[PDB]
Homo-oligomer: A and B are copies of this chain.
Amino acid sequence: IFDINGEYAQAFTGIPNVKHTILGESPNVDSLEKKQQKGELYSEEYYCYKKIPYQALGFAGLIKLLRPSDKTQLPALRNALSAINRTHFKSRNIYLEKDDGETFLLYDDCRDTNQSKLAEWLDLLRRRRLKRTNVWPPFKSLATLVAEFGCVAADRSNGSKRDAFGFSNVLPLVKIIQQLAEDIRFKSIVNLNGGGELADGGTHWDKAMSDEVDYFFGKEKGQENDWNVHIVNMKNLAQDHAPMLLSALLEMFAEILFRRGQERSYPTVLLLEEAHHYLRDPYAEIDSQIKAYERLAKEGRKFKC
């Protein structure tokens, strides 16, 4: 249930194998959660707490959320995507690390340290020949990687430099991000902490949305499904920001449903109160911009959804 008013807890009283997670403004933080075991009838106040990590949104979801629409932000975004998983951040700044141990420091106090080696630094960074990591960088990290990548140019003399005109041009993005940080909506819903494992194999991007979302729609046949209910409650929610979250959820659902398969499918219930508000984007009236809903419906018709 994609609960919007917060009333379905009463309806399913006494049915075993249920769980309901409530999201919103807790009156008091200091609380302890109690869990329920097999066989017992499900009652209220028995659940497991789960927040919204910004990691579990999808890389394309974050890219669309940022909506890069400037002169030199998309190549910077590609450089970040090719190099954001090979960085180390400790509470003050993001710094690189090669396989040999060499590190590069990114500064925010307006110092031009090592402005001539940036050519080799970015060459090796794009070539992806550095040391890996096991921590997901925070959302604040991308605010500086794009800015630093987008102001690199070479004149007749070798090397690169950072001019003040580039800083002024990228100033709107950093300033608007800082202003949005001084608000009450983004941080109250999305948790921009940053952190997570980086299990190797070359399929991390796919596996992250493949196996982690099994918490939503179950695993392959042969397991033991103790839970059969998953509800996210947003009884207080802004109608302006709901379409973005729901579109991201649908985009995530589209790819997992394709990988769901035939023999590994279960009956599914989708609740969409006032779906007409967020089914279509305001500027997506052309039939070439709908690859989520129709594909989702086709996959569901094929494989029991």
Q: A112-B154, A295-B240 are in contact. Are A3 and B175 (CB under 8 A)?
A: no
* Residues 1-16 of chain A, each 1 if its beta carbon lies under 8 Å from chain B, else 0: 1111110110010010
Surface stretch bound by B, among A21-29, A92-100, A131-139, A190-198:
A21-29
Asked if B3 and A58 sit within 8 Å, CB to CB, the answer is no
Interface magnitude class on chain A: 35 or more
Instruction: Say which residue of B36, B59, B229, B239 sits within 8 Å of A1 (CB atoms).
Output: B229
Residues from chain B with Cβ under 8 Å of A174 in the complex: 74
Spell out A's residues near B (CB within 8 Å).
Answer: 1-6, 8-9, 12, 15, 17-25, 36-38, 48, 50, 52-53, 55-65, 68-69, 71-72, 74-76, 78-79, 82, 108-113, 115-116, 119, 122-123, 126, 149-150, 152-154, 156, 160-161, 164, 167-168, 171-172, 174-175, 178-179, 182-185, 188, 205-206, 208, 212, 215-216, 226-240, 242, 244, 246-249, 251-252, 255, 258-259, 261-262, 271-274, 288, 290-292, 294-295, 298-299, 302
29 A-B pairs with CB atoms under 8 Å apart are A2-B272, A2-B273, A6-B235, A8-B231, A20-B233, A21-B215, A22-B233, A23-B232, A24-B234, A38-B226, A55-B208, A57-B248, A58-B248, A58-B255, A60-B179, A60-B255, A61-B249, A72-B110, A74-B171, A78-B178, A116-B156, A185-B255, A185-B295, A188-B258, A238-B298, A239-B294, A239-B295, A239-B299, A239-B302
Given contacts A6-B231, A64-B292, could you give 16 more A-B pairs where the C-beta distance is less than 8 Å?
A2-B271, A4-B235, A20-B233, A21-B232, A48-B215, A50-B216, A57-B248, A60-B251, A74-B175, A78-B109, A79-B109, A115-B154, A185-B295, A240-B290, A240-B291, A240-B295
